[PDB]
Amino acid sequence: VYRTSGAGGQHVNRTESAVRITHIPTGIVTQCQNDRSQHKNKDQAMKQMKAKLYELEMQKKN
Amino acid sequence: MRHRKSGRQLNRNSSHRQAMFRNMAGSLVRHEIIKTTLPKAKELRRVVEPLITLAKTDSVANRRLAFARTRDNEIVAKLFNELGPRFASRAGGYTRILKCGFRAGDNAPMAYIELVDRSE
Amino acid sequence: AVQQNKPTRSKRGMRRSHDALTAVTSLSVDKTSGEKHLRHHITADGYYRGRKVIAK
Amino acid sequence: MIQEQTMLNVADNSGARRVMCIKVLGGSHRRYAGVGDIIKITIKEAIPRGKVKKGDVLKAVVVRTKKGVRRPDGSVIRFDGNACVLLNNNSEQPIGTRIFGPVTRELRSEKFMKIISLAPEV
RNA sequence: AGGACCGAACCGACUAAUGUCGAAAAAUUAGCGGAUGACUUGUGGCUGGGGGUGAAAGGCCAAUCAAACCGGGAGAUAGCU
RNA sequence: GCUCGCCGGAAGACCAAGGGUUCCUGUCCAACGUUAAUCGGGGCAGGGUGAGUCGACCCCUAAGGCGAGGCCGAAAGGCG
RNA sequence: ACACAGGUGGUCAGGUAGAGAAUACCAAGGCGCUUGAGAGAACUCGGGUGAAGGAACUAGGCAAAAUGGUGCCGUAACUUC
RNA sequence: AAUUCCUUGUCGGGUAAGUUCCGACCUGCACGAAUGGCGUAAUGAUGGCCAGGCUGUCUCCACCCGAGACUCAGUGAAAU
RNA sequence: GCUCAACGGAUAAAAGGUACUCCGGGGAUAACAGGCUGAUACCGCCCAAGAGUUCAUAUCGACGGCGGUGUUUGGCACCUCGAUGUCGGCUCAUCACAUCCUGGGGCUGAAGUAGGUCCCAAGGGUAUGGCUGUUCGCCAUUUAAAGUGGUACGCGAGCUGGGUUUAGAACGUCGUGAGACAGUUCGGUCCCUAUCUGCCGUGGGCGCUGGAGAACUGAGGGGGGCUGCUCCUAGUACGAGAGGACCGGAGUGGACGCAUCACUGGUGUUCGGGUUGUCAUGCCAAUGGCACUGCCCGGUAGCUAAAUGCGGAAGAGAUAAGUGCUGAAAGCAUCUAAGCACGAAACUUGCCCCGAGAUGAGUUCUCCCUGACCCUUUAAGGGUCCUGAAGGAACGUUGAAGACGACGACGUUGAUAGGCCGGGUGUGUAAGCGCAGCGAUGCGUUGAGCUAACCGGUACUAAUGAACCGUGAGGCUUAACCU
16 A cells, blocks of 8 residues: 545645555556545456556467 | 853843943952942952952053953053052952942842042 | 722732732841941941951 | 765776765675775776776675774774775675785784785875 | 946845734835936825726725725615525 | 044035924923833923015916816716 | 834935945944843753765755855857857 | 656766756657747846865864753742 | 426426635545454464475465454444644654564484574674665665564654645646546645643642651662674584584673763863954054954863763572472372472563652661749630740852752851962063164063962951741650559
């Protein structure tokens, strides 16, 4: 998790739990911000795990 | 933390502080008896007793040196001429401090300062 | 910063009780003119230790 | 008393002129260097034909100190300057074969007998 | 010659500190920008509230500006306190 | 009064603007002064400003104001 | 709204050094700012100096410090010359 | 890029370490020819990246000079 | 019959942005933290074969199951919208163990050096930096190890605005348009003297019950608790070459804390000299003042550190896991139900400091107090005269003591402070005079002169002898000893 400031009024302090997921015996991380929910942010991180993981294997087959 | 500090700044900054004694001691020998704030006399006596002590042994260079101090020739026309001669026998101890009262302005400790001789 | 209450008059006096001025309790009579004057001071007319060393 | 970011002068061979410390070696949160302390340096000026070039990490052991030393009977030996000699950081070897400039009596600690052999002073 | 340059008085106020029931209802101190021009100031007048003026902010109009100030509508109205 | 220090192309000497007797002397200390004050720009009584050549008023003009004529507009009023 | 470290037009404006009304010390003149006497703790502000290193501090070389004047030789990229 | 959320995209230089900085590739979510495009000497109380010197910013602060702060005498508040 | 998109239709004619905002409000209705729950996350267990050369217990441990804590995202709107007012960093902490090393160990797919895994454990340490505001993160360099979290996602009545939100401006996209944003780019008033509680020091009054001046015991409390490398033991044990010990002893650093100015320095506006401009004593010399000590070069006593020393234990009792000894319930086994012995940086202590207001008011030593009358609830009553004790306080000179108090030295049976004498230390050849010479200037007299806090002395000066407070014999009861 890493957390960052945002936009608000006179008092605002909350920072968002932004997620960063990797495949450790390969290395490549996945941080995705295109949906804001607890495990569902992982459900795009794993979406963009396997998509980027498949983005490896396609050009190899070329 | 004032551990062995032989100085009393008297809430006066430096250049005013040294000249305070410069003007006072000249007036001190002027009338031989004055009255002032009690801590002020408790520091001037560490100056004027050397000022007699340099007048104890006379030199024209000392007279030149005692013009470099206090910048007045009539003062050293008074010193080296009665006091220095008459306090030749006395080695240390030249004024006397006694406590008058308190100042009507804002309760400042008032003391008499005069010499042990005092002209009579 | 201020009290959120008002301080009572008792603790006022409990604060105030440590504040007596003085008594001198040490009175030095002049040997010559009987001037009950301040110890280690001269008298009002200037005697000290049985002596008119004020030279006034 | 040598820390990081300290631009000493090279007084030995192996083709450097100016170096600078990034890390005081030696211990767990150690913050200072003794007279013959071990100092991880990088190279900030080297001659063109020299062995090592600018910008490469290595160990190097100091010799000369602007602060100087104290003698154990109480004399300071101040050096107007600060010098250091290089080390082979993976095998701790002083690669110095030609060193000019004085050294320290305190440096005789038997990892430096190759150094004090090449000492033309002190 | 210079909407040239360095730089006092003058005008303005870039940065930091002090100040905030302060020295002061926006200033002081050390350094700054302009200082021959689109510069600055003194005196006498003119344009005005849903308008004036504007090198343009919607800034300023007597310490009171997305609307000054005063009196009357009106004791507006208020399922809000 | 005698020493010391400070400003000194001003913390100085005169005018206009504007304030409005605050200017001087004697006497006094409750109130004014961030302290006492026989001190003062405080109270009270009294005194002080002298002009043909200084300024202003006076005569003559610009911006601008009023504006018989006059034109315009519910009136007020506006412009000339 | 105060006996307020602020602001306000015109005239005069010397001696020495100095290009200069910049600056330093003084002349003429006018004053020591209307609460002081002592103490010399923490801490705040206005300032000085500093051994070794020298931005490693930090949002950023911000604040500070350093550099600083006249003459002589010489002076690159670029350029509307 | 003052323009790119993904993205800190990708190679080298600067560097011990380099999301920012200087060039190039083009995979331009959503550059573009007067909502002007690409350069540009002189200039800027304009933003960002380094080198030289210098210093207390920092390693770790230490001492010193004053106005306050502490006591005493005089007047004696204020927010709540 | 036009006629009700919202169909009890407010006529059958009606869309937005406000972060320029403004007013009346609500925790009736959102965000941070707090609260209940625990889907999710994390952690500990249940069963179980397979991969694993032989073997499920070295691990993963699936197909599934049982629970715990409250740090993630949420769920519910309980508290506050008549303000609970800021993410991160600087700084300063601080606790629980699910522990990063460390010590004690079981086991090993640990041969050994060295590791893997599990338990006890808060005791101590738990980095310096580049880029972004980023905590996060990527990365470089060491040591033994750079531990996970809680505490309004600790700390803003301590700091910054950098981020992030207003007033200005710029870019791109969507829209007819104002403007807005899964976005980014410069600059942007950050306030407050502390009543109480809290915490660190420091005093007074009373008390301590006869008063005063001193010396300690000692409960309780706090601080301290990290270790690295090398050598001897021994390059012996072990081992497949290669490699290479625990224990006991000694030496030596880092970082942290305490103490100290002798030694190495810094400051030293109270000690000297130099020098620029300028004013003053008539001019010059000799000097003084001002310009931040004008700029400076050094330096005593002091003060602080980088400088100089020390600590990190060992040991005694019981321990946590663990190793056991003999031997049960069960004729035997087995550390176990009796008993005893070893074994952690962890506890009581040990090392030091505060310390009897610890009311349980403790112990010892010394000094001093031993006169008559009245009313009388004959009471622990009050009062006049006469003595004023031991001592303290007050006052004055002062401290390497200190905010005011306090503590210590001194008050004449005298060295507390100042001045002074000899000296010391520092600044380096004063003033005047003579010679060389056009001159400035140099040389000689001259290690002499000038000298603050320092060493040993000196009553020369100042601390006046006194005075004020404080007593005039210790209550009631009980007991063993004595006229």
